[PDB]
């Protein structure tokens, strides 16, 4: 292969087992939206379920239907629905739907009547993010509609959910505030004669660092992929599952004073040897990494030199060569062999590793190492 | 009923190709459609460019060429980036032109000619200063002697000499003239050794539009085909950006002064206002670093992003004025600018990159669609 994003399903399994230890008695919903954060939703889901995850979480019904089409029968919850969605296919495919407004509930109920299939409903409430959750003042009307719908077997009241303002800051008191607001939502439900089967608030950071805030289920995403939910703490016992690598396509001699790549932004201070790596920013190698990233080749760090192009970049091998055409360059991975990590890229680019792992594409073929 | 789309206006593609052809003068035009047409769709852009006067197509890899051929493209296609040890046989059998950048690569190609019995239509990619891949002056004489023997037995047709410019976006710089002179030197070496190339090409979009004095037999523009200016400091250069990225407004909501929005509450409302949720994010190619910087166009008005861009969504501020946005309305993230929307260059400026990277970013939920010419 020209380049690959190898997903170690053994690491996925390890991470899920670590998360289950932190979750204690709470069931685990593995979040595999965005094609498993770039790792492959279906393969990650299968591995996570086999390692004891109880359920799957995705953003869209489309993502849930793709899992269903691949043979996944485990519970799948979808929580982001565009205007105009037809909930009918979700119902016929036994996809759970989280509603975040009375309009969405009414839409879902019309679909229940049309398909004849009871909806397994979760309600998504806002406890601070201020995105699409139902707000406190609108919750009672939703409870009343839900209770009436439940009283005619139109819905099963499965879940109450909300999402944390901090993905990476377990010590901030907004975590505590959100949990208290969540408890207050549950008290509202009680006052309106409504009981949810399960309630869940926790992302990876809360699961691993705020077990005192865990409700009935946890909903980890980033930690399933082995990426630290609190980077300042280190790897938190997780193993990043994605390794991005590519073959050395060319080894070329350069004389001192020669410029390299567009604009000649790098000029060789010495006679040296370069490696051409045939992936670039159209493949997810952020152009801002130019002149800052390093790769690992035959156990040695080799720094990028010159601009990242659309489909290639150069690294400096130094001055007799220990690298041949066809040898493997590791761009990032768990770090086991000394390679950079997704967090290293995030630091260089000014982003977070979530964005790093949803970047590889194009010539970077996704592959799998079995557990 | 798409949640989001990258709408490619093929009438813009046609316009841009006709503009490039005018600038090309006496030269023919090879449309560069690598990286899936710079994210615009290699096959659809290729078909349009060919109908608007493009003579040939250029891609990086044989794989890209084979995808065009599989889609029914029969026009000339040149591929110029090959991994070591490639089997060139499939390229030969699919009538893919091959640019070689080393003597070793020529040997691989001739080995494939021997195995398949199919003549290779060869271009030599020479190094005139980029120092990436390309045959250097030291190796070119040996290359010519080898090509002459291969041509004599009809193992190769010697189609092309090519090189690539160090500056994609600065036509005035003297290195452009230096590279053109080095390129002429390669051509003169070939002529003196009795090796005739049918065509020579050096010009990218920048050179094609701004340095007609440096044009050889073909020009090889990419970025300007997609309407993106090859010299941003000169403006749109008469081109029309062909990609419009847009999405449906998923939610409109009011918020109160003092409330934070999105992860980390990095934006706190200074006043009561209305927000819209746009259901695409950085996994769809909306660079996270756009957060708190970008604006979108909704019903003719600029609406700034507020709070962090999430994996699959972000919020924009509609303001506290009379609400003129409904769920299901169209929000334009970038486009040619005709309606006052931001451009890809605007994104490039905000995040510190180039529009080349902007247009190869949209993906995921952003479905590629086409408006016919
Ligand atoms: C051999 C060759 N010839 C013409 C073009 C077309 O170049 P542009 O007209 O400037 O788009 C390209 C494309 N180069 C891409 C652009 O971004 N970075 C790159 O490496 C090319 O590799
Ligand atoms: C409803 C819901 N529940 C759990 C998780 C899992 O969160 P995490 O453990 O931090 O990966 C997410 C993921 N949210 C994001 C990741 O990147 N941008 C985002 O908006 C989520 O939307
Ligand atoms: Ca409307
Ligand atoms: Cl959501
Ligand atoms: Cl929310
Ligand atoms: Cl050579």
From Swiss-Prot, chain A:
SMART domains registered for this protein in UniProt: Ala_racemase_C (SM01005)
Alphabetized InterPro entries for the sequence: Ala_racemase, Ala_racemase/Decarboxylase_C, Ala_racemase_C, Ala_racemase_N, Ala_racemase_pyridoxalP-BS, PLP-binding_barrel
Example GO biological process: peptidoglycan biosynthetic process
Pathway assignment: Amino-acid biosynthesis; D-alanine biosynthesis; D-alanine from L-alanine: step 1/1
Record keyword Isomerase present: yes
Catalytic activity, as annotated: L-alanine = D-alanine
Modification type N6-(pyridoxal phosphate)lysine: residues: 33
Notes on how activity is controlled: Inhibited by the antituberculous drug D-cycloserine (DCS), which is a structural analog of D-alanine.
Catalytic center residues: 33, 262
Key words, A-Z: Isomerase, Pyridoxal phosphate
Binding site for substrate: 131, 310
PROSITE patterns: ALANINE_RACEMASE
GO MF terms held by the record: alanine racemase activity; pyridoxal phosphate binding
Quaternary structure note: Homodimer.
Function: Catalyzes the interconversion of L-alanine and D-alanine. D-alanine plays a key role in peptidoglycan cross-linking.
Protein name: Alanine racemase
Gene: alr
Curated annotation (Swiss-Prot), chain B:
Cofactor (UniProt): pyridoxal 5'-phosphate
Matches recorded under PROSITE patterns: ALANINE_RACEMASE
N6-(pyridoxal phosphate)lysine, modified sites: 34
Family annotation (InterPro entries): Ala_racemase (IPR000821), Ala_racemase/Decarboxylase_C (IPR009006), Ala_racemase_C (IPR011079), Ala_racemase_N (IPR001608), Ala_racemase_pyridoxalP-BS (IPR020622), PLP-binding_barrel (IPR029066)
Any one Gene Ontology cellular component term annotated for this protein: cytosol
Regulation: Inhibited by the antituberculous drug D-cycloserine (DCS), which is a structural analog of D-alanine.
Domain of life: Bacteria
Enzyme class: isomerase
Gene Ontology BP annotations: D-alanine biosynthetic process; peptidoglycan biosynthetic process
Positions of substrate binding: 132, 311
Gene3D superfamilies: Alanine racemase (3.20.20.10), Lyase, Ornithine Decarboxylase, Chain A, domain 1 (2.40.37.10)
GO terms of molecular function: alanine racemase activity; pyridoxal phosphate binding
Active-site feature positions: 34, 263
Reaction(s) this enzyme catalyzes, per UniProt: L-alanine = D-alanine
Pathway linked to the protein: Amino-acid biosynthesis; D-alanine biosynthesis; D-alanine from L-alanine: step 1/1
Function: Catalyzes the interconversion of L-alanine and D-alanine. D-alanine plays a key role in peptidoglycan cross-linking.
Record note on quaternary structure: Homodimer.
NCBIfam families the record matches: alr
Assigned protein family: Belongs to the alanine racemase family.
Name of the protein in its database record: Alanine racemase
Organism: Mycobacterium tuberculosis (strain ATCC 25618 / H37Rv)
